Amino acid sequence: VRYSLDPENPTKSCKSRGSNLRVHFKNTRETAQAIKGMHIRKATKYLKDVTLKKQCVPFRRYNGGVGRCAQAKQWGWTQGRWPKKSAEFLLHMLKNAESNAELKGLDVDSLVIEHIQVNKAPKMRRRTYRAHGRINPYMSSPCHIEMILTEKE
RNA sequence: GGCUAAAUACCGGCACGAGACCGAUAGUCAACAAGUACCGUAAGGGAAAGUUGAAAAGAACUUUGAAGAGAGAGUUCAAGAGGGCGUGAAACCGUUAAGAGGUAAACGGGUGGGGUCCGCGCAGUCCGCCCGGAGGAUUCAACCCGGCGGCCGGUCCGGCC
RNA sequence: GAGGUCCGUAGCGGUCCUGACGUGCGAAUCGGUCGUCCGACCUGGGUAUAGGGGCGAAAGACUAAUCGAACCAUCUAGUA
RNA sequence: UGAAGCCUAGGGCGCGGGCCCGGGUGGAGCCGCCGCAGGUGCAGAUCUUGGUGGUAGUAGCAAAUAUUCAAACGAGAACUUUGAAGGCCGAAGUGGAGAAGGGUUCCAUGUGAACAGCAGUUGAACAUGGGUCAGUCGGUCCUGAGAGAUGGGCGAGCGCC
RNA sequence: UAUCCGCAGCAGGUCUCCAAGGUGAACAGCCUCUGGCAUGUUGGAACAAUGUAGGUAAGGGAAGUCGGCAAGCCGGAUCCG
RNA sequence: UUGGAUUGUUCACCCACUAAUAGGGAACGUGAGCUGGGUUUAGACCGUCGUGAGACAGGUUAGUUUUACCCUACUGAUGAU
RNA sequence: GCCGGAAAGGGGGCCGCCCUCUCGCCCGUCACGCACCGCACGUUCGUGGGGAACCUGGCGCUAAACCAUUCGUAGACGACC
Numbered sequence: 037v038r039y040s041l042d043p044e045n046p047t048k049s050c051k052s053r054g055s056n057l058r059v060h061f062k063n064t065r066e067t068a069q070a071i072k073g074m075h076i077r078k079a080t081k082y083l084k085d086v087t088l089k090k091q092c093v094p095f096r097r098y099n100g101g102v103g104r105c106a107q108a109k110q111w112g113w114t115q116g117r118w119p120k121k122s123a124e125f126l127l128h129m130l131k132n133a134e135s136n137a138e139l140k141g142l143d144v145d146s147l148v149i150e151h152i153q154v155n156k157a158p159k160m161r162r163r164t165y166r167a168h169g170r171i172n173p174y175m176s177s178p179c180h181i182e183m184i185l186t187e188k189e
Numbered sequence: 190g191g192c193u194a195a196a197u198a199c200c201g202g203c204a205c206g207a208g209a210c211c212g213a214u215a216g217u218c219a220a221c222a223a224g225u226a227c228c229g230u231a232a233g234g235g236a237a238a239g240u241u242g243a244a245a246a247g248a249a250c251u252u253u254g255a256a257g258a259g260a261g262a263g264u265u266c267a268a269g270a271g272g273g274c275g276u277g278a279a280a281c282c283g284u285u286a287a288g289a290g291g292u293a294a295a296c297g298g299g300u301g302g303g304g305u306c307c308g309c310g311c312a313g314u315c316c317g318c319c320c321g322g323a324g325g326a327u328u329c330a331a332c333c334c335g336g337c338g339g340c341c342g343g344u345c346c347g348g349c350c
Numbered sequence: 351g352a353g354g355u356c357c358g359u360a361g362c363g364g365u366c367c368u369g370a371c372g373u374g375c376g377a378a379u380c381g382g383u384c385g386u387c388c389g390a391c392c393u394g395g396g397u398a399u400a401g402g403g404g405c406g407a408a409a410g411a412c413u414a415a416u417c418g419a420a421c422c423a424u425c426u427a428g429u430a
Numbered sequence: 431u432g433a434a435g436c437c438u439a440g441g442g443c444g445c446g447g448g449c450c451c452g453g454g455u456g457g458a459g460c461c462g463c464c465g466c467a468g469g470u471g472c473a474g475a476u477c478u479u480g481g482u483g484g485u486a487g488u489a490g491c492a493a494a495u496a497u498u499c500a501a502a503c504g505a506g507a508a509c510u511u512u513g514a515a516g517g518c519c520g521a522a523g524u525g526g527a528g529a530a531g532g533g534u535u536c537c538a539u540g541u542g543a544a545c546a547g548c549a550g551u552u553g554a555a556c557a558u559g560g561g562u563c564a565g566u567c568g569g570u571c572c573u574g575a576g577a578g579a580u581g582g583g584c585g586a587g588c589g590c591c
Numbered sequence: 592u593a594u595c596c597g598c599a600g601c602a603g604g605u606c607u608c609c610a611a612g613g614u615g616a617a618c619a620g621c622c623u624c625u626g627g628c629a630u631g632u633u634g635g636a637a638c639a640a641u642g643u644a645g646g647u648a649a650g651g652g653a654a655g656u657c658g659g660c661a662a663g664c665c666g667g668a669u670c671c672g
Numbered sequence: 673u674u675g676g677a678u679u680g681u682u683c684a685c686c687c688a689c690u691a692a693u694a695g696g697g698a699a700c701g702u703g704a705g706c707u708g709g710g711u712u713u714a715g716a717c718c719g720u721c722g723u724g725a726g727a728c729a730g731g732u733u734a735g736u737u738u739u740a741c742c743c744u745a746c747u748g749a750u751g752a753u
Numbered sequence: 754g755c756c757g758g759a760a761a762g763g764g765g766g767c768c769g770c771c772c773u774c775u776c777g778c779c780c781g782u783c784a785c786g787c788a789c790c791g792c793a794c795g796u797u798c799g800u801g802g803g804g805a806a807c808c809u810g811g812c813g814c815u816a817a818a819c820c821a822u823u824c825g826u827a828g829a830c831g832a833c834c
């Protein structure tokens with residue numbers, strides 16, 4: 037609808053969008069940061085590998101308490117994880133984006149992720165019961181995902 | 190032993206009219222399915238909640254997906270108004286760009302450097318009088334005719350106060 | 351085959367570990383260990399007693415998680 | 431031919447309170463001067479209401495021995511259903527049935543937005559429809575502990591004894 | 592141990608009926624049949640410290656500690672006494 | 673620069689060993705490290721005091737010890753220029 | 754070509770070379786130059802350090818590290834053998 041950063045060429049680019057998705061915002065943002073600059077096929081392969089725990093997602097900003105792994109050394113970090121539903125949500129969105137590019141009449145095997153953004157969506161409340169008859173929130177953190185692919189060779 | 194209208198009172202009730210009043214955290218608790226939802230054995234306690242547009246014209250149709258949800262297409266002046274939709278601030282977050290980074294950060298004074306913009310900067314003011322040179326007009330002073338105005342008549346005539 | 355008799359189930363209770371937990375499973379729970387268990391026994395329903403009053407084998411205990419004077423509204427925007 | 435409001439690395443003025451221009455967004459009203467009036471200026475009050483952070487993807491999802499294989503349906507299976515295997519409750523039960531209480535939770539079909547602190551093809555969730563039959567089971571009848579009128583008494587009185 | 596009350600599918604609370612086989616004094620504990628269930632609001636990989644709940648320890652035997660706290664010893668039945 | 677008997681003890685005293693059984697500080701070091709014996713609530717008993725409710729640097733017995741996942745410091749483990 | 758150097762290694766001296774100058778230095782003669790019209794950061798070390806590319810040539814070179822896997826002399830996870 038209204039994209040935060042428009043493409044430099046509206047003809048050599050395709051767009052995809054999703055709102056109010058029940059996936060953790062902090063995990064999804066790091067997955068998007070991991071796949072930010074990749075070719076479409078490389079990104080799809082990497083996302084499959086993450087889902088199968090063959091490659092990690094390096095947790096850089098939201099790293100509090102995250103454990104270490106040996107697979108983040110190839111990212112030049114120490115802490116990584118494998119958020120699989122985070123990976124597959126934007127895998128579905130990537131598939132939608134490539135379908136959009138094919139519909140608009142583009143070269144699918146030259147598309148590079150040029151823009152990707154994860155915003156924070158309205159929270160939905162549940163309730164948890166604590167000691168001494170107290171009630172605390174059990175909130176959730178849905179997110180908005182917004183991505184732009186473009187050709188470059 | 191007794192009766193008795195008028196002038197007098199009126200935050201309830203049926204209708205009305207008005208205001209230097211309030212303007213949705215205000216004004217009644219209640220602008221809305223409000224003494225409603227809801228809590229308490231009960232007596233009782235008691236909310237939050239307004240706004241698309243002029244008009245639903247409320248997004249046919251193609252396409253990816255199991256679907257939510259997207260990409261096009263279309264309506265509208267405007268979707269940067271898409272069914273909790275007027276405007277859309279701050280705290281907080283994402284991304285892009287620029288800069289920086291071992292005494293937490295921020296701050297005052299003094300410069301320096303770099304940016305973003307502005308000056309619409311880029312050969313730099315005019316204004317009077319006079320001298321000289323080329324010009325061009327119905328053209329100056331004086332005189333006459335008419336109109337208007339300002340000051341007087343040592344004490345002009347007439348009014349009014 | 352007697353006993354407000356003994357050991358010991360169900361039930362009723364709540365000693366010690368000063369154990370577990372202590373933003374708990376829980377605004378008093380959990381485990382093991384314990385007391386009593388034919389009697390002043392345990393228990394549902396009905397019924398009576400109501401706040402300076404009730405009821406109390408008496409701890410100022412209980413009276414709807416509130417008790418050395420309950421709760422609700424009002425006097426009340428009480429006084430400092 | 432664009433008011434209020436809002437944003438601004440744009441230009442300025444004022445010692446200051448503040449104010450004026452430019453740009454953008456917005457879509458219907460607003461301001462200067464002379465007087466008048468006041469529910470008239472917030473950083474605090476363990477202030478009121480609403481919203482948002484760091485903590486933090488952290489604490490935590492450890493009471494009661496236990497699951498595995500194959501198939502089916504399904505877009506999708508650690509969790510649904512069928513079969514097999516291995517276990518538990520162990521007749522003072524994790525069995526079969528009632529009273530108080532609940533009030534449609536009962537049964538069937540369908541759905542997977544929300545809820546069932548993972549997930550779900552399942553559900554006491556949501557949507558459609560169904561379902562409780564009495565001379566001989568109970569209430570209705572009796573009276574118990576007790577409650578309660580009339581006559582009467584007391585009482586300012588509602589009324590009470 | 593999910594249709595009731597406790598704010599909740601809350602280890603709490605809430606009145607009764609029926610009651611198999613073996614062992615055994617026994618309605619004790621333990622194993623099974625009829626009936627039921629899926630380990631109690633999740634799973635997977637490892638087996639560090641510290642914990643919680645269980646055990647075992649040479650020689651000594653309360654020297655520990657305010658205090659034998661905690662654990663341990665004893666345990667049923669028969670015959671003496 | 674110790675092992676013990678008695679005491680809640682600090683202090684004290686005694687037995688034994690020893691080479692010697694010196695003295696002190698760190699918020700009278702150290703309770704989100706423990707314990708809870710003493711003091712130090714609410715229950716009770718005694719003596720003295722008070723007419724009484726009650727009092728006692730007098731004795732006695734029974735009595736809930738909460739929270740770390742934050743920053744630092746420290747102990748280890750990756751890594752970074 | 755010969756030597757000269759290790760504490761954090763010497764662009765130095767010497768022996769020959771094919772060549773070229775009577776030029777370099779000091780006094781004199783001789784004229785010439787953007788004489789830019791009084792005016793500032795002028796004059797170097799400097800082919801300075803660093804980063805990208807345009808390049809014509811010659812000489813050469815076609816490696817590892819990490820993940821995945823395995824191991825258990827190691828281990829909470831990383832890490833390590």
Ligand SMILES: [Mg+2]
Pocket residue numbers: 096097098099100
């Ligand atoms: Mg961080």
Ligand SMILES: [Mg+2]
Pocket residue numbers: none
């Ligand atoms: Mg931490």
Ligand SMILES: [Mg+2]
Pocket residue numbers: 164165166167
């Ligand atoms: Mg809880």
Ligand SMILES: [Mg+2]
Pocket residue numbers: 169597
């Ligand atoms: Mg509760």
Ligand SMILES: [Mg+2]
Pocket residue numbers: none
């Ligand atoms: Mg008379």
Ligand SMILES: [Mg+2]
Pocket residue numbers: none
């Ligand atoms: Mg009279």
Ligand SMILES: [Mg+2]
Pocket residue numbers: none
């Ligand atoms: Mg009038």
Ligand SMILES: [Mg+2]
Pocket residue numbers: 213
């Ligand atoms: Mg409002």
Ligand SMILES: [Mg+2]
Pocket residue numbers: none
């Ligand atoms: Mg209101």
Ligand SMILES: [Mg+2]
Pocket residue numbers: none
């Ligand atoms: Mg409002």
Ligand SMILES: [Mg+2]
Pocket residue numbers: none
């Ligand atoms: Mg408003």
Ligand SMILES: [Mg+2]
Pocket residue numbers: 213214
């Ligand atoms: Mg409001």
Ligand SMILES: [Mg+2]
Pocket residue numbers: 240
């Ligand atoms: Mg609105």
Ligand SMILES: [Mg+2]
Pocket residue numbers: 267
């Ligand atoms: Mg508009």
Ligand SMILES: [Mg+2]
Pocket residue numbers: 270275
């Ligand atoms: Mg609008």
Ligand SMILES: [Mg+2]
Pocket residue numbers: none
């Ligand atoms: Mg809006």
